[PDB]
Design a protein around this ligand. Structure first.
Ligand SMILES: [Mg+2]
Ligand SMILES: [Mg+2]
Ligand SMILES: [Mg+2]
Ligand SMILES: [Mg+2]
Ligand SMILES: [Mg+2]
Ligand SMILES: [Mg+2]
Ligand SMILES: [Mg+2]
Ligand SMILES: [Mg+2]
Ligand SMILES: [Mg+2]
Ligand SMILES: [Mg+2]
Ligand SMILES: [Mg+2]
Ligand SMILES: [Mg+2]
Ligand SMILES: [Mg+2]
Ligand SMILES: [Mg+2]
Ligand SMILES: [Mg+2]
Ligand SMILES: [Mg+2]
Ligand SMILES: [Mg+2]
Ligand SMILES: [Mg+2]
Ligand SMILES: [Mg+2]
Ligand SMILES: [Mg+2]
Ligand SMILES: [Mg+2]
Ligand SMILES: [Mg+2]
Ligand SMILES: [Mg+2]
Ligand SMILES: [Mg+2]
Ligand SMILES: [Mg+2]
Ligand SMILES: [Mg+2]
Ligand SMILES: [Mg+2]
Ligand SMILES: [Mg+2]
Ligand SMILES: [Mg+2]
Ligand SMILES: [Mg+2]
Ligand SMILES: [Mg+2]
Ligand SMILES: [Mg+2]
Ligand SMILES: [Mg+2]
Ligand SMILES: [Mg+2]
Ligand SMILES: [Mg+2]
Ligand SMILES: [Mg+2]
Ligand SMILES: [Mg+2]
Ligand SMILES: [Mg+2]
Ligand SMILES: [Mg+2]
Ligand SMILES: [Mg+2]
Ligand SMILES: [Mg+2]
Ligand SMILES: [Mg+2]
Ligand SMILES: [Mg+2]
Ligand SMILES: [Mg+2]
Ligand SMILES: [Mg+2]
Ligand SMILES: [Mg+2]
Ligand SMILES: [Mg+2]
Ligand SMILES: [Mg+2]
Ligand SMILES: [Mg+2]
Ligand SMILES: [Mg+2]
Ligand SMILES: [Mg+2]
Ligand SMILES: [Mg+2]
Ligand SMILES: [Mg+2]
Ligand SMILES: [Mg+2]
Ligand SMILES: [Mg+2]
Ligand SMILES: [Mg+2]
Ligand SMILES: [Mg+2]
Ligand SMILES: [Mg+2]
Ligand SMILES: [Mg+2]
Ligand SMILES: [Mg+2]
Ligand SMILES: [Mg+2]
Ligand SMILES: [Mg+2]
Ligand SMILES: [Mg+2]
Ligand SMILES: [Mg+2]
Ligand SMILES: [Mg+2]
Ligand SMILES: [Mg+2]
Ligand SMILES: [Mg+2]
Ligand SMILES: [Mg+2]
Ligand SMILES: [Mg+2]
Ligand SMILES: [Mg+2]
Ligand SMILES: [Mg+2]
Ligand SMILES: [Mg+2]
Ligand SMILES: [Mg+2]
Ligand SMILES: [Mg+2]
Ligand SMILES: [Mg+2]
Ligand SMILES: [Mg+2]
Ligand SMILES: [Mg+2]
Ligand SMILES: [Mg+2]
Ligand SMILES: [Mg+2]
Ligand SMILES: [Mg+2]
Ligand SMILES: [Mg+2]
Ligand SMILES: [Mg+2]
Ligand SMILES: [Mg+2]
Ligand SMILES: [Mg+2]
Ligand SMILES: [Mg+2]
Ligand SMILES: [Mg+2]
Ligand SMILES: [Mg+2]
Ligand SMILES: [Mg+2]
Ligand SMILES: [Mg+2]
Ligand SMILES: [Mg+2]
Ligand SMILES: [Mg+2]
Ligand SMILES: [Mg+2]
Ligand SMILES: [Mg+2]
Ligand SMILES: [Mg+2]
Ligand SMILES: [Mg+2]
Ligand SMILES: [Mg+2]
Ligand SMILES: [Mg+2]
Ligand SMILES: [Mg+2]
Ligand SMILES: [Mg+2]
Ligand SMILES: [Mg+2]
Ligand SMILES: [Mg+2]
Ligand SMILES: [Mg+2]
Ligand SMILES: [Mg+2]
Ligand SMILES: [Mg+2]
Ligand SMILES: [Mg+2]
Ligand SMILES: [Mg+2]
Ligand SMILES: [Mg+2]
Ligand SMILES: [Mg+2]
Ligand SMILES: [Mg+2]
Lengths: 126, 206, 50, 146
RNA sequence: UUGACCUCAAAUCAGGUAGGAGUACCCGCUGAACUUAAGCAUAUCAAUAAGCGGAGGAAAAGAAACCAACCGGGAUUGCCUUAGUAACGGCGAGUGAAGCGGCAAAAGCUCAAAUUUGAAAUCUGGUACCUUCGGUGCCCGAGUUGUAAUUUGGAGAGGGCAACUUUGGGGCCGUUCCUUGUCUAUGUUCCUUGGAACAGGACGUCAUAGAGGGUGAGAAUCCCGUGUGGCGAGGAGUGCGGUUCUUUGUAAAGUGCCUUCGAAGAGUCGAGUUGUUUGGGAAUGCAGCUCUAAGUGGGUGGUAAAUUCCAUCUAAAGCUAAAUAUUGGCGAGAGACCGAUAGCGAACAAGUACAGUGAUGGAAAGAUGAAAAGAACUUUGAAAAGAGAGUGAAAAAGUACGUGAAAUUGUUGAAAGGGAAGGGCAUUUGAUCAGACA
RNA sequence: GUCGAAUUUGGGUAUAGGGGCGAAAGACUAAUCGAACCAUCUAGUAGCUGGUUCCUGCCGAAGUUUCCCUCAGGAUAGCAG
RNA sequence: CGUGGAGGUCAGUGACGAAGCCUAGACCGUAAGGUCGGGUCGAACGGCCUCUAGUGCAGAUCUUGGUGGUAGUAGCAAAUAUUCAAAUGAGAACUUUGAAGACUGAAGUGGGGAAAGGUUCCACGUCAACAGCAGUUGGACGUGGGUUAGUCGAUCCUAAGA
RNA sequence: CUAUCUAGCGAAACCACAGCCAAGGGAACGGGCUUGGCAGAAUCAGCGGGGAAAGAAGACCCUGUUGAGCUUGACUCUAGU
RNA sequence: AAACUUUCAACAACGGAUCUCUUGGUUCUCGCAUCGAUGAAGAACGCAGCGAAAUGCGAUACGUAAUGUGAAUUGCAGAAUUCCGUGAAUCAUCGAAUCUUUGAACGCACAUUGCGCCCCUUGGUAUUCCAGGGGGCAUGCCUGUUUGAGCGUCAUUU
């Protein structure tokens, strides 16, 4: 259990801190786990999802589908995959909204910084 | 304490074909005209509003306190009570259950769970952790959310890492002999907790 | 009125500006809650008290 | 409003007493804060022991005089018979009291002997720099019981 | 004529300070009545509410003109007690403290009155430079109607005699304290149900981590955290640990004996009287007016007075951390609390909408679904809509949207009804149904 | 009724609650007047009026004594558990 | 007996349907109540030993909210008054235009202002609500446009007074 | 001009449950209770017998150890003088 | 016999109880000491590509600078050069700025966007009139500076 005096087990406080979290904080909550491949590749279990990454839906009814993240919708706590959409009745397609904890990262998108993140978590990077 | 009293309402007195509770003054809102202050009034003050100087704790004479926990210890033998209490003890060798003092030096959960298993704890540990349900009440949202049974209570003479080893395994409490809380010896005021004593602790008892 | 102080006309102007309905694009925003304009005012219904 | 056979109570709640109720909900809180206080101080205070040397003194009136009890400070006389001045004894952790007088030799000697034993049983580090780390004893009252 | 001095002016003169806010807690002033007394004025409520002035992070109090009466104690504050006691009181209703004792925290001091008189030794300001919370040089200025050193009653000061002992001020780096950033385990394997697995079963792993929240349903092991640790960053600061540069000094301080002294607060203390207040009682404090001291004096010693003693302090000037308070403010952790008529009035564009000339008064109002997938298209219609269709796990979820009670309403079905209806015991008839045979 | 004046009347201005203003009715002082309105003291007090929320089991009264500024109320004895 | 919550326990019930709600269907209890079926529903909840209380309603001219009978009822009757046609429109007693009949009778139902409102002005669009019948009309609703100063007011002056 | 009938629009008071009598007894004037008279759907315009109809916790009267405006050689004070 | 009234049921109304929710409230505890003439608290009016409000801001106006993060914002449009980068962002942090008309509110007023004075500067042929730009002028009190007043009063002239 919590041993620190600055942690709060309070449920009402957690749920406030989630929904009222600023854009910067949602970035890290919106982490997705690396694929078993990419994990032993990079020596790292999970990373905050970013836009042009590549991803496989491992949960839900889009289970098995893959694509490129078209946008991180931080406001909505949802990530959108280009290639995963609803065809509507009038035929106009519309994005589905996915949660990064139900995705898996199959290809990263690397930066000077995106690399340094992997290095700051203590893992190899091919 | 200022609740329900935050208005200037007065009774309209008799003669209006309307009851006598004070009523909010003025107009244009419809708050105005409504019963105020009353214990039966919407928005009124409650009857006998709760106060903080109510008695919360309770004094128990130190000696009878001891008599109680003595009694509670003496019942952690007597396998019928431990059995009647929950506590799957049929598969354990003997009661009191005394264990090597080496147990107090175990530094690691898995090791300590393994130790407990070897001595018979297993089915009790499994009784917890098969038992965790959602608290039925509104306590569920009061930071009381989950629930479960009580596991075995490991008693040591000196904490060499046993206290931190078992601290994460559901249901298990650890206690120095020197303390011995009555709340854990008879949880829910029910005698016969399953107690796993180390030998060092078992002798300090005398 | 019909000869007014500038403070009176100034307030009078700000109330003209507040007299529209809910701009309908707000209605579409994420978590949008506001339905209509509930502060809307009419000249023969509620008076401005200056 | 008087009936049966009952003691006559005198319960003074005719003022607005609910205004002035004090429930000590902070008992446990302030005990911790007092323990932390002492801890933080013992650290700031170097090996020095949190408390000052206190004299033997005979407790006043007819009821308590049979018992002897710790006083405030040491009476410029008693300080002088132990061979140090007031100003220096204050820097040494001895409490000095200019107001107390000696009418009684037996107590006078007890406090001079108390001062003697204290001087022997302490070490006073040099002004210089060195501070030869000495491990604080926290009491004086416990080391020098009365 | 010229130059001071005293006192009083003026500058958009050079530099500063005050106001207002808040006010939970704190220091003062002012000040009720409802109420209680079974009526009522003294009393009580209450030295309370409202009104006024003033502070702080605490305020105030504080190094005894104290308590005591003992073998005496020894600043203040607070808690436990003293004690519902001593005492006050139409001695009625009611009121009501203190000393001792235990504990928390502890801490002590500085002026006035002294000839530096072989040297105003002191200080604001301006100005130039400097190592700028400051230093130094110089000039105006203050100030002898007294600015420094020295001394504060515990003392202490001037002489004379005799010995030892003891230092100051900078830099700089840590730690301390403050603000922060980052990183740090373990399944998303199989089967079943489901729209969704976060459910049940199987088989595992981590656990100094099985607090918590998130994710399409009860998720330690999907995510963020949690636990244990690691690595940084920016500060403040003299608390102290190290270091290191200057020796402050022909400086400062402590101690023993001899001797001479020993300055110590006035329209005050105190007294009378009046009013108020207090448990304070021939008067507890406070204030007005009149009277007004002394220096082996003065104050107190809880029954007025005269005499004689005794004990105990040293007023009429001053500073001071902690233990203490806190329905305010900033930041946190919580609960056998309330759960949308509850809980703050306000879970919402709530002190809003609205009322009132104004002071002020002041509501109602949360919930489609995992996802808008918020109904394409056809048909009837002037339209709104209807009927199809479509979406959805479900429209028995359609922005009138979770569940959707009751009063009350429509339809359909059944039955009864000569100025109410409803009810009790009993049985006919109709409808409906349990159990039990074997 | 009166209608050229002790006339009618706008605006500005003064007077404020035991106070104002009154050719005097206790009139008028913002639908409020034998003491306006607002908030607070205040949940004022009420021997008086109204209400007081589940079941069953056993026992089961009093309206009388005495005192009371007592007579719609208390205390006291009695009856009751 | 029954409610909210708390300790213990039955490794209790449940998305293969918890709770709730409905039901002249069933069963247990003298009763407070308990139990089951069916329907509806959608995420939680119960038994037992103990703890706890903001714990049980028919009344209080009770509080707030909702709803009836009354009842398609009282009524929509002051200010003399309307009528024919055409246009428009899904739709015309009520809008537009033409015609007729009237009225206010300059002490105006006329032409402008002060106070007060504050956009009601004007145009275009336009009928869900509103104008106690209607509505194509409007002081409504939507979207826009419009208020030009050396000489007109303010501003300056003084009045009671502040 | 209403009422009245129609189209549109459409409230309120009030309401234990209700609504035919005579007698009786009864809280001494019953819609209900006892005994009789009687009694047939559903209704429209009127009406003022009854509903001890409605409208306000009776203004009168008494009680209350409840007030307030006013007066006075009531008690007790007080600005002023 | 209907209609009508009434009772029960089903389905549909009305209405929003109930159950289950909870970014709110309440109460306790712990830590801390920071408003304002260096213009506070409060007020008014403004500010977005498309806003009435709420929240934020001040003509540099849902923001400018700086620092950390490291790719968003998102209702629509949008820019596109912002994606191995002095760089996205309704982000976090915040140390630099801007900060209308006001307010203790300070040139005087204020039911007025009313009315003065001084200084520097620019334009109009301008020390003097008009216009634009910038900077100023409240009150009490303290220390000091400077110009003073009084037979209050000392001296010094010839
Ligand atoms: Mg990370
Ligand atoms: Mg009524
Ligand atoms: Mg309330
Ligand atoms: Mg429940
Ligand atoms: Mg009007
Ligand atoms: Mg308004
Ligand atoms: Mg208003
Ligand atoms: Mg008390
Ligand atoms: Mg407190
Ligand atoms: Mg101490
Ligand atoms: Mg040192
Ligand atoms: Mg100046
Ligand atoms: Mg102030
Ligand atoms: Mg009271
Ligand atoms: Mg009384
Ligand atoms: Mg009384
Ligand atoms: Mg009275
Ligand atoms: Mg008093
Ligand atoms: Mg008093
Ligand atoms: Mg006050
Ligand atoms: Mg004040
Ligand atoms: Mg402050
Ligand atoms: Mg403190
Ligand atoms: Mg002293
Ligand atoms: Mg003391
Ligand atoms: Mg008494
Ligand atoms: Mg008193
Ligand atoms: Mg969940
Ligand atoms: Mg979870
Ligand atoms: Mg951590
Ligand atoms: Mg003195
Ligand atoms: Mg007074
Ligand atoms: Mg007195
Ligand atoms: Mg005497
Ligand atoms: Mg003494
Ligand atoms: Mg001083
Ligand atoms: Mg002081
Ligand atoms: Mg608090
Ligand atoms: Mg509410
Ligand atoms: Mg409740
Ligand atoms: Mg409310
Ligand atoms: Mg819902
Ligand atoms: Mg709802
Ligand atoms: Mg349809
Ligand atoms: Mg269909
Ligand atoms: Mg459903
Ligand atoms: Mg539904
Ligand atoms: Mg729809
Ligand atoms: Mg529904
Ligand atoms: Mg029946
Ligand atoms: Mg059968
Ligand atoms: Mg059968
Ligand atoms: Mg009055
Ligand atoms: Mg009065
Ligand atoms: Mg007066
Ligand atoms: Mg009125
Ligand atoms: Mg009036
Ligand atoms: Mg009451
Ligand atoms: Mg009352
Ligand atoms: Mg009575
Ligand atoms: Mg009997
Ligand atoms: Mg008497
Ligand atoms: Mg009676
Ligand atoms: Mg029970
Ligand atoms: Mg339930
Ligand atoms: Mg039924
Ligand atoms: Mg059955
Ligand atoms: Mg169900
Ligand atoms: Mg749900
Ligand atoms: Mg119980
Ligand atoms: Mg209750
Ligand atoms: Mg009810
Ligand atoms: Mg009722
Ligand atoms: Mg009842
Ligand atoms: Mg009711
Ligand atoms: Mg109709
Ligand atoms: Mg009609
Ligand atoms: Mg009529
Ligand atoms: Mg007519
Ligand atoms: Mg017509
Ligand atoms: Mg005519
Ligand atoms: Mg005429
Ligand atoms: Mg219409
Ligand atoms: Mg209208
Ligand atoms: Mg109409
Ligand atoms: Mg219409
Ligand atoms: Mg318009
Ligand atoms: Mg003119
Ligand atoms: Mg002008
Ligand atoms: Mg006809
Ligand atoms: Mg009709
Ligand atoms: Mg008869
Ligand atoms: Mg009759
Ligand atoms: Mg009747
Ligand atoms: Mg009649
Ligand atoms: Mg009637
Ligand atoms: Mg009455
Ligand atoms: Mg009276
Ligand atoms: Mg009166
Ligand atoms: Mg008389
Ligand atoms: Mg007289
Ligand atoms: Mg939910
Ligand atoms: Mg809370
Ligand atoms: Mg915005
Ligand atoms: Mg930002
Ligand atoms: Mg001014
Ligand atoms: Mg101006
Ligand atoms: Mg200017
Ligand atoms: Mg001066």
């Amino acid at each position: 259990a919590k041993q620190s005096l600055d942690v709060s087990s309070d449920r009402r406080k957690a749920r406030k801190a989630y929904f009222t979290a600023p854009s910067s904080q949602r970035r890290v909550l919106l982490s997705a786990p690396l694929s078993k491949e990419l994990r032993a590749q990079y020596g790292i279990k999970a990373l905050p999802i970013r836009r042009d990454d590549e991803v496989l839906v491992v949960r839900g009814s889009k289970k098995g589908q893959e694509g490129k993240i078209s946008s991180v919708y931080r406001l909505k706590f949802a990530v959108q995959v280009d290639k995963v959409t609803k065809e509507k009745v009038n035929g106009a397609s519309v994005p589905i909204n996915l949660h990064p904890s139900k995705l898996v990262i199959t290809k990263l998108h690397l930066d000077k910084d995106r690399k340094a993140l992997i290095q700051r978590k203590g893992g190899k990077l091919e | 304490e200022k609740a329900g009293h935050q208005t200037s309402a007065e009774s309209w007195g008799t003669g209006r074909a309307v009851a006598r509770i004070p009523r909010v003054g003025g107009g244009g809102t419809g708050r105005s005209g409504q019963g105020a202050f009353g214990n039966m009034c919407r928005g009124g003050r409650m009857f006998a509003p709760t106060k903080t100087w109510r008695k919360w704790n309770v004094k128990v004479n130190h000696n009878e306190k001891r008599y109680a926990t003595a009694s509670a210890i003496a019942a952690t033998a007597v396998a019928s009570l431990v059995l009647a209490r929950g506590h799957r003890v049929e598969k354990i060798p003997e009661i009191p259950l005394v264990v090597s003092t080496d147990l107090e030096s175990i530094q690691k959960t898995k090791e300590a769970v393994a130790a407990l298993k070897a001595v018979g704890a297993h089915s009790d540990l499994l009784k917890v952790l098969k038992s965790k349900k959602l608290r039925a009440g509104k306590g569920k949202y009061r930071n009381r959310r989950w629930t479960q049974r009580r596991g075995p209570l490991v008693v040591y003479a000196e904490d060499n890492g046993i206290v931190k080893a078992l601290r994460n395994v559901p249901g298990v409490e650890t206690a120095n002999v020197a303390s011995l809380n009555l709340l854990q010896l008879a949880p829910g005021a029910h005698l016969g907790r399953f107690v796993i004593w180390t030998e060092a602790a078992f002798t300090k008892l005398d | 009125a019909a000869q007014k102080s500038f403070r009176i006309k100034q307030k009078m102007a700000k109330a003209k500006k507040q007299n529209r309905p809910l701009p309908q694009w707000i209605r579409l925003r994420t978590n949008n809650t506001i339905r209509y304009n509930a502060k809307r005012r009419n000249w023969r219904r509620t008076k401005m008290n200056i | 409003a008087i009936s049966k056979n009952l003691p006559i109570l005198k319960n003074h709640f005719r003022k607005h007493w609910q205004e002035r109720v004090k429930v000590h909900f902070d008992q446990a809180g302030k005990k911790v804060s007092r323990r932390n206080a002492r801890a933080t101080r013992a650290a700031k205070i170097a090996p020095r022991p949190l408390d000052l040397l206190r004299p033997v003194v005979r407790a006043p009136t007819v009821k308590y005089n049979r018992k002897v009890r710790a006083g405030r400070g040491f009476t410029l006389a008693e300080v002088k018979a132990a061979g140090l001045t007031a100003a220096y004894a204050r820097t040494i952790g001895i409490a000095v009291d200019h107001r107390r007088q000696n009418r009684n030799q037996e107590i006078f000697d007890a406090n001079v002997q108390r001062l003697k034993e204290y001087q022997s049983k302490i070490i006073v580090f040099p002004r210089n720099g060195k501070a030869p780390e000495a491990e604080q004893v926290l009491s004086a009252a416990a080391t020098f019981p009365i």
